[PDB]
Design an enzyme around this catalytic site. Structure first.
Site, mmCIF file in Angstrom:
data_model
loop_
_atom_site.group_PDB
_atom_site.id
_atom_site.type_symbol
_atom_site.label_atom_id
_atom_site.label_comp_id
_atom_site.label_asym_id
_atom_site.label_seq_id
_atom_site.Cartn_x
_atom_site.Cartn_y
_atom_site.Cartn_z
ATOM 1 N N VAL A 138 -0.100 -10.629 1.476
ATOM 2 C CA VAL A 138 1.262 -10.995 1.093
ATOM 3 C C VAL A 138 2.255 -9.946 1.621
ATOM 4 C CG1 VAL A 138 1.234 -9.953 -1.240
ATOM 5 C CG2 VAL A 138 2.725 -11.908 -0.762
ATOM 6 N N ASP A 139 1.799 -8.694 1.731
ATOM 7 C CA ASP A 139 2.592 -7.598 2.312
ATOM 8 C C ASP A 139 3.051 -7.977 3.721
ATOM 9 O OD1 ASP A 139 3.798 -5.078 2.676
ATOM 10 O OD2 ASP A 139 1.907 -3.969 2.549
ATOM 11 N N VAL A 174 -7.282 -8.238 -0.948
ATOM 12 C CA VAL A 174 -8.141 -7.232 -0.328
ATOM 13 C C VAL A 174 -8.520 -6.093 -1.291
ATOM 14 C CG1 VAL A 174 -7.082 -7.755 1.921
ATOM 15 C CG2 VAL A 174 -6.457 -5.654 0.726
ATOM 16 N N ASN A 234 0.865 -1.172 0.000
ATOM 17 C CA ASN A 234 0.000 0.000 0.000
ATOM 18 C C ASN A 234 0.908 1.230 0.000
ATOM 19 O OD1 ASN A 234 0.108 1.319 2.918
ATOM 20 N ND2 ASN A 234 0.112 -0.912 3.211
HETATM 21 N N1 LIG Z 1 2.501 -15.724 1.220
HETATM 22 C C1 LIG Z 1 1.925 -15.513 0.016
HETATM 23 N N2 LIG Z 1 2.518 -15.881 -1.144
HETATM 24 C C2 LIG Z 1 1.937 -15.668 -2.343
HETATM 25 N N3 LIG Z 1 0.731 -15.083 -2.476
HETATM 26 C C3 LIG Z 1 0.032 -14.672 -1.392
HETATM 27 C C4 LIG Z 1 0.601 -14.866 -0.058
HETATM 28 N N4 LIG Z 1 -0.293 -14.376 0.820
HETATM 29 C C5 LIG Z 1 -1.347 -13.900 0.114
HETATM 30 N N5 LIG Z 1 -1.146 -14.089 -1.203
HETATM 31 C C6 LIG Z 1 -2.013 -13.713 -2.333
HETATM 32 O O1 LIG Z 1 -1.537 -12.492 -2.901
HETATM 33 C C7 LIG Z 1 -2.615 -11.925 -3.652
HETATM 34 C C8 LIG Z 1 -2.766 -10.441 -3.325
HETATM 35 O O2 LIG Z 1 -3.571 -10.284 -2.163
HETATM 36 P P1 LIG Z 1 -3.275 -9.150 -1.068
HETATM 37 O O3 LIG Z 1 -2.055 -9.608 -0.306
HETATM 38 O O4 LIG Z 1 -4.603 -8.900 -0.365
HETATM 39 O O5 LIG Z 1 -2.843 -7.841 -1.907
HETATM 40 P P2 LIG Z 1 -3.791 -6.779 -2.667
HETATM 41 O O6 LIG Z 1 -5.111 -7.363 -3.127
HETATM 42 O O7 LIG Z 1 -2.911 -6.104 -3.692
HETATM 43 O O8 LIG Z 1 -4.136 -5.712 -1.519
HETATM 44 C C9 LIG Z 1 -3.106 -4.877 -1.008
HETATM 45 C C10 LIG Z 1 -3.440 -4.439 0.405
HETATM 46 O O9 LIG Z 1 -3.351 -5.556 1.294
HETATM 47 C C11 LIG Z 1 -2.321 -5.318 2.269
HETATM 48 O O10 LIG Z 1 -1.593 -6.508 2.567
HETATM 49 C C12 LIG Z 1 -1.414 -4.278 1.639
HETATM 50 O O11 LIG Z 1 -0.682 -3.507 2.594
HETATM 51 C C13 LIG Z 1 -2.428 -3.440 0.917
HETATM 52 O O12 LIG Z 1 -3.069 -2.586 1.862
HETATM 53 C C14 LIG Z 1 -3.862 -12.737 -3.302
HETATM 54 O O13 LIG Z 1 -4.144 -13.688 -4.339
HETATM 55 C C15 LIG Z 1 -3.471 -13.438 -2.017
HETATM 56 O O14 LIG Z 1 -4.180 -14.659 -1.780
#
Ligand SMILES: Nc1ncnc2c1ncn2[C@@H]1O[C@H](COP(=O)(O)OP(=O)(O)OC[C@H]2O[C@@H](O)[C@H](O)[C@@H]2O)[C@@H](O)[C@H]1O
EC number: 3.1.1.106
Length: 171
Positions: free
Chosen positions: A32-33, A123, A23
């Site tokens: 994943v962040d 998310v 973000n």
């Molecule tokens: N360990 C992991 N390895 C690979 N993929 C993953 C992992 N954990 C989650 N994912 C996948 O990564 C993809 C992206 O999901 P999010 O992590 O929710 O990222 P995004 O949709 O871009 O939303 C970003 C928002 O979420 C917060 O973590 C971040 O700080 C930002 O506010 C999804 O398919 C999720 O299932």
């Protein structure tokens, strides 16, 4: 031969560069962040704060590169995908930007491999099929035009995303 689909946790994959779906604050989050910050350890957050001093927040579509801490990678590229708001706020272009700008940083820093998560599909709620189409097309065109990165891994966290990618790559 240069694009691979991998099922699993991106924090375990040994590659030059792991891409974070961040973000704009760059200070972490819950998907994943959070997983990347946890695996890298506190050094990553400290590196992101330095980046904030250099260039402020990371706007949607932008990417920044940092050290990788305890990750099995040499660097982490942090990018911010769009929040899906139903397609009329330029989300498709912004998602493409996230992939392109991340790839440009990989190439500019002479790294040979990079792993991507499914940016914006957690998310941020980007429809999965459309997002994967954008990831695959963007990456494909880029490596058609550029020698670096040599290898790209699409890391999919569940069987179904792996299938969408595998199906897209064979078309
Ligand atoms: N360990 C992991 N390895 C690979 N993929 C993953 C992992 N954990 C989650 N994912 C996948 O990564 C993809 C992206 O999901 P999010 O992590 O929710 O990222 P995004 O949709 O871009 O939303 C970003 C928002 O979420 C917060 O973590 C971040 O700080 C930002 O506010 C999804 O398919 C999720 O299932």
């Amino acid at each position: 031969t240069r694009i691979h689909v991998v099922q699993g946790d991106i924090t375990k994959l040994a590659v030059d560069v792991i891409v974070n779906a961040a973000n704009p604050s760059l200070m972490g989050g819950g998907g994943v962040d959070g997983a990347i910050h946890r695996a890298a350890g506190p050094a990553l957050l400290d590196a992101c704060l330095k980046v904030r001093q250099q260039q402020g927040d990371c706007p949607t579509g932008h990417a920044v590169i940092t050290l990788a801490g305890d990750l099995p990678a040499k660097a982490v590229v942090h990018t911010v995908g769009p929040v899906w708001r139903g397609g009329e706020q330029n989300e498709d272009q912004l998602l493409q930007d996230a992939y392109l700008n991340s790839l440009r940083l990989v190439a500019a820093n002479s790294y040979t491999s990079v792993a991507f998560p499914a940016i914006s599909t957690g998310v941020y709620g980007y429809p999965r099929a459309a997002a994967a189409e954008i990831a695959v097309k963007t990456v494909s065109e880029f490596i058609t035009r550029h020698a670096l990165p040599e290898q790209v891994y699409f890391v999919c966290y569940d069987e179904e995303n792996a299938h969408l990618y595998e199906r897209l790559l064979t078309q």
